[PDB]
Design a protein around this ligand. Structure first.
Ligand SMILES: Nc1ncnc2c1ncn2[C@@H]1O[C@H](COP(=O)(O)OP(=O)(O)OP(=O)(O)O)[C@@H](O)[C@H]1O
Ligand SMILES: Nc1ncnc2c1ncn2[C@@H]1O[C@H](COP(=O)(O)OP(=O)(O)O)[C@@H](O)[C@H]1O
Ligand SMILES: Nc1ncnc2c1ncn2[C@@H]1O[C@H](COP(=O)(O)OP(=O)(O)O)[C@@H](O)[C@H]1O
Ligand SMILES: [Mg+2]
Ligand SMILES: [Mg+2]
Lengths: 144, 145, 48, 1622
């Protein structure tokens, strides 16, 4: 039971993608859902150690490149990197409600080389910022 | 006469082309000469003891390989071809390479289309200098594109 | 049955095996540098 | 009385059986009925062999031998006659049909006319007496056949230029091999023999259709049986020439398809624009027209319907008739889906699946058009799609159809494609179609790139098939040079065919650059063909290819498929890359592929299943452990989906069968509704993915299956009838069979899994560690399938790494451009030809060896969907459906993903074959197979009964095996190496009992004595088999563990280890020290090369080697150099009089050629009815190949040693392959023994675990200080008997020798310098040096003996030292050691500063003064100037020392010198000066710019002839600069050690050498006549007459490099470090 409620550094894992699949398997088995029906949603909380629900998993060490996360809203920044305090990975059913027109799919690369892609995160933008501007400025998420 | 170096008969065509051109005065270009460094040393020796035609020119295409003979580099004139330093230099190279007649055709809107193409090509090529941020890998966005 | 235990156990297995190999290799390097054991082909590569 | 009856049947059959003759064009009567003749001989040979089994065979033994001989002669005679007659048939047609061959090839025609007349002469002789026995007794009929076969072959290879001219007439002949083309031209009259060659010239034409006369070509047919009837049949009588009527057939092919398409388009227009479609009418139209035309008509109808709808929508605000188009597509799709759900003929079913696949794409496109609101036909959303336009008003039928995509305009080539597996039109495929069509319009090439299994070459073929083009796939490798690629382009230019060069980057970078020139000019010719100003009535478009003007067809295209980042591939030049448009095909749209295929196969839940199986593979990829043999890409999904359709069909056919048996109910709807489609998908997944899974990954995948497919379980259907077949086969092969959880249950499951992969994949791979049961699994299955199905199983086992890649696939001659088949190509071609019915047998080509991309990617097209072996000469070999390509490997660490994804993997973990299964196999064979060839069997059965309790699970042997793995050994431990050594030793124990029974005929062994001997020997064998390759301390550690756990009686010595005891034949433990006496060596035999002082180590190792050698078991001695491995082996071989030993010295450049040359000299190949047998020339003697440096041969970048792979195949399989004719050669009476330094030593590579499985290893360590005192104290005692006064000093002399040797061995090691190796060999030379000095002297005081002792120490331990402080240490410690062991002596008299000994100033070897020596050398140097070399020298002290060191070596047999020092130091000048004084003749090789390996061989033969035949002493001085190639050192390495080179003298050189050797032996008065005796005398003379001086610079890295390239330089040559002048 404690293995579910530990905060895991994705960069330090030997195979980070197996953890994401393993958390996906646990949620489906517990909720009697099919594996393919599960979808991943991202929630960044400043207070590390916050309580995780039945389907939320906390991953730490993630670094945000070229953007700052505030109230789960991404904003373009002039800094090279921005540390994410605690990323809560939640597995939910697919509701196919289309995009919100302010949602950008950020790649989550293992490292700064941007060679191996672990998964993708669907963050939402704040204010009047352009989702194209995020694409042009190379905004991404780094595990380590 | 253009010859690609790398085949046994390719050296024969290179020798025949050079022997004829030094008298007729034509141009001979040999590409990928860096793949035959041993034959390059013989080529440099042959060129040193030679009295070619005034209009004869020999072009050697290589890839800045560290195995290119030093004596060949000293004997010949070196021109280094690389990505242009910036957007302004990138667009100047594009506009110079394209013939003036091609840009100026019957539709007067063709010129602006070429300018946008030149600007677009310059932007993506300059983004390659920043490998992780500009792209995800060093793509080969070159003249062929 | 728990998928998380399956993953975490596997990570420990690779980690422990790599930890033992690295520590044993470093201990051998100390022995060679101390003049207490003979240098082998693999130790020459590792030390180099 | 049955034996008479069998002989009566054989006699009557052969007295009446007549050769069946058929008239051949009124020229002769050819033999017909080949299969019946061969089967009769085969069944009669087997019957005679079965007759030999009966105990009453002896009375009829003689007569059966005659029948056995005659049957062998009959088989041998007609095994060649079938090839001679066949070659004559098509050679006669070429030399008679064409009236022009007599001029171009006049001499070749003359040879054939002479050969034909002789062949026709033999026709009448056979026709007169058609009886087989009569034609068998014809005088020299066999030898006449061998010459006729040889002569006919000579003409066949002499027609290459004629065939090249013939290929120009019909350009499709460029893709037909030389032999097949000769058959095509020669057998033009026999059109029926041409049906097997149409598949190589046409995309889908497998055979042509002819009338009863076989003179008019009515049409063509495909492999699946689909037939196209020509509108105007082609008459062969009107066009007799083969190329003339073949061109008409090809032309009529396109016209007929064009006319049939127009009729098909007219019919399908009714189905289009129709709200309701009658299924009966639609099915009739589908069955009426060909598969490619049915799909094409649907595309034309849909595109016209969409274009019409868009034209109506051209008003902008009008309605949307596109809904009507979408409605018609969906109505048509529903009819197709309904038809598939019910049973259809196989050809109609494939047509329906093709229609569903395209109409799904049409439905998707129409939905996209409706969604995006396109109202204009010029909109790019419609223009970017592929559109088909038909013009019935066009006069030319070939131009009626136009295919347009974006701005690219194409015409249908109307090539008959037969039935091809259509791909799912995914968005990635649309991107591929758009990009390649843009390249075609720009006249550039296509370059799809990406990882393995992304559907790149299939997409290119699909696009080519979409345009009706002939697409040829070429699997490119480094052998595709400029000429091969250019000739391929020439064929593609003239034919008008697409070239898909997959793995194009595997060419060399220089080859890729050179090829770019040919691609550039082809594109330029294509570009100028597109100019509208060009008129087809003008001159045709031509391009310069291979110095010729080649016409370029407009339909040509070049496509290259590449994997950029994979291993074994090169980097393309930039100028080549600009000629191709590249597309990144990385992520295939696999979700749509699964959905469409399952929908077309009849699955009702295709959308649900696709949404479940596609994520499942992704989850498996991201969850399962990373293994080298894991692939869950599109190919793994493709195999599962294909299996799902097959499993559903067999289940539907199954369910129908109970229903008709149980009652009368055949309803397709009810069966389809109550069909567990989700169970079917899991069955395909389990049958394809589970076998590759490792033990830990099976629960993960099963958990994934349960979560992806909840509530669905899979029960593996029991393959019952196969299991009893496996059980019977396992019983006959002494294997263990088990069911489920029983013993051997896992192994049987692996065999069943392996059987399932055979039914699914044509390419298999068996991955698993050594000794996991891989070989036994496929061997048992192959034999069991033969019993179960009645189909004969033939296996071709090939070691791909034991031979070069040229010998595996074949080579193209650089000059004559003639193709020579390789090992794999010859085997595959023989099966394809099916001359002896190889197509009716189950053919399994097993690759037992390492896999690397250099050789395995040549099989990429073979293991792909192409199933085709493409060769650089343009020839392609289709893989027969009965042929399986199997790989038996231990790992896939070096294989790329291109080949892993291409095979079905079965994983054999080491736990599959448990230890008790191996114990059962050993015990079963012991109780059944006698060791002698029964009293011997009874001994084995009694011994097996005694050993039964110990050979059980958790028993003594198992516990000892487990403990031995914890101890470390000199080499990596494997289970079978210990078990294999243990089993061989136990066999010797049984032979020991048999010998005792023979030695005591009256009183044989009883049960009580046998138990004592066997139980004690088992412990003795266990200790020496598990700890044989370990140090002495861990030999006792294993003995201590055994003592703790065993109950067998053991020696009661409180401290003596069990390893020091042996088992007497009486069944009692006896110490090994009882067999070690204090011998007294003869004075003249002091430290002789063959004298062995017996110690504890020597007696134990000799007995151990005798046990392994007597069983002819390969073995390896491991230890530090000079330990005694060669000494121990030869001593043990002296106890075996029937074994001759041949020494081979391995080096870094050692190849199997070294073994082959030894086989040529010492063995002979002989033809036997069972095949080729390689046996030693001497009868009754076993040849022992002693390889001294097995671990030095270089291991390539893929972790394989070719010579080690050669031996491993040649030890495990008992033979090798002769690359001269691709035949299997089986060894006989040939044994192998290896020696090596520890693998941790520099330059030593660890041996393969597969090789080490069959080869036990014994560790021979350096003798200890106690042993060294015993060995050399005996030598000193014998040597000092020359001078009785000095006999008292023998004990201190040995102590001083041992101490200084020990101190030097510790002070100087290989860490400082590579050559700082000190061994008992230095001690042996130390004893010889003193003995040789003491021998001439009648008397000598103690001081003189110590001076000799010090002088030898200086020459042995200080000459090789580099630094001056090392030499100073040796000088000081020599004084201290001598002063300690020898007190109260005159130190100044014995330890005078210059210790110099010479025989120049006196008769004997006595100390010399420096000034007297300097005067003598100066006087000799003066004379040396006028005589030999007029180069003045300055004499200093170091030169005087050096000339003495050179002189001492020149006075010794096989005395080779290695002088190391800076250039100009006088090394060569001193060597020449000393050789002149010693009478040697100085020889130096005159190297120059053009000096090559052949020149070095000529020089070596000159030296050996002078020094071996003429008895001339020669000082062969060679410099490191003279080494111009690695072969120079390889020849020198063999000459330095053995004194001979195996392959130096061959052919006329060998014959001339024997002539000279006979004269030389006569001049010596020796009675030598045989070649073997003469060569032995020649080798002995070379050893004692040739001295080799090697001079090299004192480099650091070069010195270490020479230690591995030429090991004999540091083991046979005395090293003198001249260095620089101090
Ligand atoms: N089912 C079985 N029952 C009993 N003994 C077996 C069985 N299968 C294999 N063996 C024995 O175990 C050993 C394994 O040999 P095998 O050729 O099957 O192994 P392998 O995995 O192919 O080895 P390698 O990697 O050397 O090719 C042999 O001595 C063989 O006789
Ligand atoms: N018991 C022994 N009796 C006599 N000589 C021995 C004995 N043990 C070792 N030696 C000496 O050790 C040397 C072994 O060298 P060798 O067998 O050629 O080494 P390797 O087998 O490694 O090539 C021999 O020269 C031999 O004189
Ligand atoms: N002791 C010496 N006194 C004078 N000259 C010497 C002496 N030793 C070598 N030389 C010179 O070295 C030259 C020959 O060099 P050589 O012995 O062939 O070189 P290496 O030792 O590399 O084989 C001669 O010309 C000779 O003059
Ligand atoms: Mg391919
Ligand atoms: Mg095997």
């Amino acid at each position: 039971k404690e293995l579910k409620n530990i905060h895991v550094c994705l960069g330090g894992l030997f195979v980070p993608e197996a953890y994401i699949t393993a958390t996906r398997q646990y949620v489906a088995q517990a909720n009697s859902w099919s594996l393919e029906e599960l979808c991943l949603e991202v929630n960044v909380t400043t207070s590390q150690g916050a309580t995780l629900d039945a389907c939320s998993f906390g991953v730490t060490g993630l670094k945000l490149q070229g953007a700052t996360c505030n109230n789960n809203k991404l904003s373009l920044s002039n800094a090279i990197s921005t540390a994410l305090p605690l990323t809560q990975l939640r597995w939910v059913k697919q509701t196919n409600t289309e995009k919100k027109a302010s949602v950008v799919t950020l790649p989550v690369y293992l490292n700064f080389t941007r060679a191996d892609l672990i998964f993708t995160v669907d963050f939402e933008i704040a204010t009047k910022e352009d989702p194209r501007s995020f694409y042009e400025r190379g905004v991404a998420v780094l595990c380590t | 006469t253009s010859i690609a170096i790398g085949s046994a008969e390719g050296f024969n065509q290179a020798d025949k082309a050079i022997n004829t051109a030094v008298k007729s005065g034509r141009w001979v270009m040999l590409k990928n000469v860096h793949l035959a460094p041993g034959w390059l040393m013989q080529l440099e020796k042959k060129l040193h003891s030679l009295q070619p035609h005034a209009c004869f020119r020999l072009f050697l295409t290589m890839e800045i390989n560290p195995k290119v003979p030093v004596n060949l580099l000293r004997a010949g004139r070196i021109f280094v071809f690389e990505p242009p330093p910036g957007v302004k230099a990138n667009m100047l190279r594009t506009f110079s390479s394209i013939p003036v007649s091609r840009i100026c055709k019957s539709p007067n809107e063709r010129a602006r289309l070429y300018f946008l193409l030149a600007w677009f090509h310059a932007i993506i090529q300059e983004r390659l200098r920043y490998a992780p941020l500009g792209w995800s890998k060093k793509y080969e966005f070159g003249e062929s594109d | 049955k728990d998928p998380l235990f399956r993953f975490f156990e596997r990570e420990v297995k690779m980690g422990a095996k790599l930890l033992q190999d690295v520590r044993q290799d470093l201990a051998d390097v100390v022995q060679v540098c101390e003049g207490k054991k003979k240098q082998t082909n693999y130790l020459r590569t590792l030390i180099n | 009385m049955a034996l008479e009856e069998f002989l009566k049947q054989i006699r009557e059959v052969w007295n009446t059986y007549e050769l069946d003759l058929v008239n051949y064009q009124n020229k002769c009567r050819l033999i017909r009925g080949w299969d019946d003749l061969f089967n009769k001989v085969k069944e009669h040979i087997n019957s005679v062999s079965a007759m030999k089994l009966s105990p009453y065979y002896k009375v009829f033994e003689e007569d059966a031998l005659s029948w056995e001989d005659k049957l062998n002669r009959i088989m041998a005679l007609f095994d060649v006659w079938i090839d001679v007659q066949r070659r004559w048939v098509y050679l006669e047609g070429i030399f008679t049909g064409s009236a022009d061959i007599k001029h171009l090839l006049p001499v070749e025609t003359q040879r054939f006319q002479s050969i034909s007349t002789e062949f026709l002469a033999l026709m009448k002789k056979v026709s007169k007496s058609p009886l087989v026995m009569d034609v068998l007794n014809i005088q020299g009929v066999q030898r006449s056949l061998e010459r006729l076969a040889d002569l006919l072959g000579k003409i066949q290879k002499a027609l290459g230029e004629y065939l090249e001219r013939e290929r120009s007439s019909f350009p499709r002949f460029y893709f037909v091999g030389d032999e097949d083309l000769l058959e095509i031209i020669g057998n033009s009259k026999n059109v029926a023999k041409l049906q097997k060659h149409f598949k190589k010239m046409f995309a889908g034409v497998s055979s042509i259709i002819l009338n009863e006369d076989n003179s008019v070509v009515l049409g063509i047919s495909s492999r699946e049986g689909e037939e196209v009837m020509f509108k105007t049949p082609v008459s062969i009588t009107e066009h007799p020439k083969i190329n003339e009527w073949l061109t008409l057939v090809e032309k009529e092919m396109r016209v007929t398809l064009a006319k049939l398409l127009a009729e098909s388009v007219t019919e399908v227009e009714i189905f289009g624009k129709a709200t309701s479609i009658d299924p009966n009418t639609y099915i009739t139209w589908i069955d009426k027209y060909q598969a490619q035309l049915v799909v094409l008509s649907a595309q034309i109808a849909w595109s016209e319907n969409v274009e019409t709808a868009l034209s109506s929508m051209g008003g902008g605000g009008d309605a949307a008739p596109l809904h009507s188009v979408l409605s018609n597509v969906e109505v048509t799709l529903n009819v197709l889906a309904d038809s598939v759900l019910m049973e259809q003929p196989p050809l109609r079913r494939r047509k329906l699946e093709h229609l569903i696949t395209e109409l799904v794409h049409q439905r998707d496109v129409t939905r996209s058009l409706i969604k995006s609101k396109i109202d204009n036909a010029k909109s790019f959303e419609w223009l970017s799609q592929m559109r088909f336009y038909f013009d019935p008003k066009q006069t030319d039928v070939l131009q009626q159809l136009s295919i347009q995509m974006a701005n690219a305009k194409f015409n249908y080539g109307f090539e008959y494609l037969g039935v091809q597996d259509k791909l799912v039109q995914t968005p990635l495929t649309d991107r591929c179609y758009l990009t390649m069509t843009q390249a075609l319009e720009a006249r550039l090439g296509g370059s799809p790139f990406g990882p393995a299994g992304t559907g790149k070459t299939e997409s290119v073929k699909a696009l080519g098939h979409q345009l009706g083009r002939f697409v040829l796939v070429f699997n490119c490798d480094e052998t595709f040079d400029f000429q091969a690629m250019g000739r391929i382009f020439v064929g593609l230019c003239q034919v008008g065919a697409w070239g898909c060069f997959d793995e194009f980057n595997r060419l060399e970078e220089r080859m890729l650059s050179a090829v770019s020139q040919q691609v550039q000019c082809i594109q330029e010719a294509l570009r100028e063909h597109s100019n509208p100003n060009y008129d087809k009535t003008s001159a045709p478009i031509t391009c310069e290819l291979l110095n010729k003007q080649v016409k370029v067809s407009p339909d040509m295209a070049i496509f290259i498929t590449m994997n950029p980042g994979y291993a074994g591939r090169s980097n393309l030049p930039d100028n080549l890359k600009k000629l191709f448009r590249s597309l990144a095909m990385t992520k295939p749209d696999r979700q749509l592929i699964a959905q469409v295929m399952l929908y077309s196969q009849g699955f009702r839940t295709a959308e649900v299943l696709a949404n479940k199986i596609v994520p499942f593979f992704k989850l498996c990829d991201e969850q399962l452990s990373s293994q080298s043999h894991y692939d869950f890409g599109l190919r793994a999904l493709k195999s599962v989906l294909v299996s799902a359709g097959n499993v559903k069909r067999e289940r539907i056919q199954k369910i129908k069968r109970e229903k008709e048996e149980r009652g009368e109910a055949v309803d397709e709807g009810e069966i389809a509704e109550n069909l567990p489609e989700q169970e079917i998908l899991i069955q395909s997944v389990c049958e394809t993915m589970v076998p590759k899974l490792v033990a830990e990954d099976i629960p993960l995948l099963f958990s994934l299956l349960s979560d992806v497919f909840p509530g669905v379980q899979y029960h593996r259907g029991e393959m019952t009838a196969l299991r009893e077949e496996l059980k019977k086969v396992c019983q006959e092969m002494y294997l263990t069979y088990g069911d489920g959880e029983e013993v051997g249950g896992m192994w049987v499951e692996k065999v069943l899994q392996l059987y399932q992969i055979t039914q699914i994949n044509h390419g298999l791979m068996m991955v698993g560690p050594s000794g996991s049961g891989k070989s036994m699994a496929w061997r048992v299955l192959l034999k069991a399938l033969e019993r179960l199905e009645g189909v004969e199983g033939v296996a071709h086992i090939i070691d791909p790494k034991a031979i070069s890649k040229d010998h595996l696939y074949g080579t193209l001659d650089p000059n004559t451009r003639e193709w020579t088949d390789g090992l794999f190509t010859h085997v595959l071609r023989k099966i394809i030809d099916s001359v002896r019915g190889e197509l009716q047998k189950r053919q399994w080509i097993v690759f037992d060896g390492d896999v690397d991309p250099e050789w395995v990617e040549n099989l990429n097209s073979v293991l792909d969907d192409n199933k085709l072996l493409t060769l650089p000469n343009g020839e392609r070999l289709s893989l027969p459906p009965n042929v399986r390509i199997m790989f038996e490997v231990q790992d896939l660490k070096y294989a790329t993903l291109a080949t892993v994804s291409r095979c079905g993997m079965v994983w054999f973990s080491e736990d599959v074959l448990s230890t008790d299964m191996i114990f059962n196999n050993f015990l079963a064979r012991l109780r059944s197979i006698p060791l002698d060839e029964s009293p011997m069997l009874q001994i084995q059965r009694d011994a097996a009964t005694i050993m039964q309790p110990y050979f059980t699970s958790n028993g003594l042997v198992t516990k000892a095996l487990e403990h031995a793995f914890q101890l470390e050994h000199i080499m990596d431990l494997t289970r079978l190496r210990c078990l294999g050594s243990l089993f061989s030793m136990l066999h010797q124990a049984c032979r020991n009992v048999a010998q005792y029974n023979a030695n005591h005929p009256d009183f044989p062994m009883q049960i009580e004595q046998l138990e004592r001997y066997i139980q004690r020997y088992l412990v003795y064998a266990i200790l020496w088999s598990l700890s044989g390759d370990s140090r002495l301390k861990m030999r006792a550690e294993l003995g201590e563990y055994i003592r703790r756990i065993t109950t067998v009686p053991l020696p009661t010595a409180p401290n003596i280890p069990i390893i020091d005891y042996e088992v007497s034949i009486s069944g009692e433990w006896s110490p090994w020290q009882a067999k070690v006496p204090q011998i007294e060596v003869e004075t003249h035999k002091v430290a002789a090369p063959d004298v062995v002082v017996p110690t504890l180590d020597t007696v134990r190792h000799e007995a151990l080697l005798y046990t392994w050698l007597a069983e002819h078991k390969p073995l390896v001695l491991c230890g530090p150099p000079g330990s005694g491995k060669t000494m121990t082996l030869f001593s043990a071989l002296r106890a075996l009089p029937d074994m001759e030993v041949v020494g081979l010295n391995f080096s870094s450049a050692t190849t199997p050629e070294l073994l082959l040359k030894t086989f040529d000299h010492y063995c002979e190949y002989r033809r036997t009815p069972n095949g080729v047998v390689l046996a030693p020339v001497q009868l009754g003697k076993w040849l022992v190949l002693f390889c001294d440096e097995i671990n030095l041969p270089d291991m390539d970048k893929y972790g394989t040693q070719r010579v080690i792979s050669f031996i491993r195949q040649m030890v495990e399989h008992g033979g090798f392959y002769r690359t001269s004719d691709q035949t299997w050669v089986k060894l006989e009476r040939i044994q192998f023994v290896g020696a090596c330094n520890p693998p941790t030593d520099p330059g030593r590579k660890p041996l393969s675990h597969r090789f080490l499985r069959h080869v036990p290893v014994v560790y021979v360590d350096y003798p200890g200080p106690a042993s060294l005192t015993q060995i050399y104290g005996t030598f000193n005692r014998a040597m000092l008997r020359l001078i009785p006064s000095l006999r008292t000093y023998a004990e201190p002399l040995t102590a001083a020798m041992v101490e200084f040797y020990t101190m030097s061995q510790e002070r100087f090691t290989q860490d400082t310098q590579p050559h700082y190796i000190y061994s008992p060999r230095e001690m042996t030379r130390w004893v010889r040096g003193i003995f040789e000095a003491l021998r001439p002297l009648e008397t000598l005081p103690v001081e003189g003996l110590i001076r000799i002792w010090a002088h030898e120490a200086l020459r042995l331990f200080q000459d090789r030292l580099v630094e001056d402080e090392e030499r100073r240490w040796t000088d000081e410690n020599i004084d201290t050691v001598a002063l300690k062991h020898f007190p109260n002596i005159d130190r100044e008299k014995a330890m005078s500063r210059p210790i110099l000994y010479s025989n120049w100033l006196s008769k004997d070897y006595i100390p010399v003064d420096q000034e007297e020596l300097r005067d003598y050398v100066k006087a000799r140097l003066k004379v040396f100037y006028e005589e030999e070399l007029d180069v003045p020298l300055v004499l200093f002290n170091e030169v005087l020392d050096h000339v003495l060191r050179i002189d001492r070596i020149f006075r010794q047999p096989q005395g080779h010198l290695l002088l190391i020092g800076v250039s100009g130091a006088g090394k060569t000048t001193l060597s020449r000066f000393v050789a002149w004084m010693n009478g040697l003749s100085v020889y130096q090789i005159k190297v120059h710019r053009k000096y090559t390996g052949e020149d070095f061989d000529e020089d070596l033969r000159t030296v050996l002839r002078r020094s071996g035949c003429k008895n001339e002493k020669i000082a062969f001085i060679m410099d490191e600069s003279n080494v111009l190639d690695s072969g120079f050192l390889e020849r020198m390495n063999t000459l330095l050690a053995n004194g001979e080179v195996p392959g130096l003298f061959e052919g006329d050189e060998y014959a001339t050498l024997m002539t000279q050797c006979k004269e030389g032996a006569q001049k010596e008065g020796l009675m030598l006549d045989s070649h073997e005796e003469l060569y032995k005398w020649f080798t002995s003379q070379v050893i004692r007459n040739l001295h080799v001086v090697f001079t090299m610079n004192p480099s650091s890295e070069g010195l270490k490099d020479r230690a591995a390239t030429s090991p004999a330089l540091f083991n046979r040559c005395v090293l003198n470090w001249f260095g620089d002048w101090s």
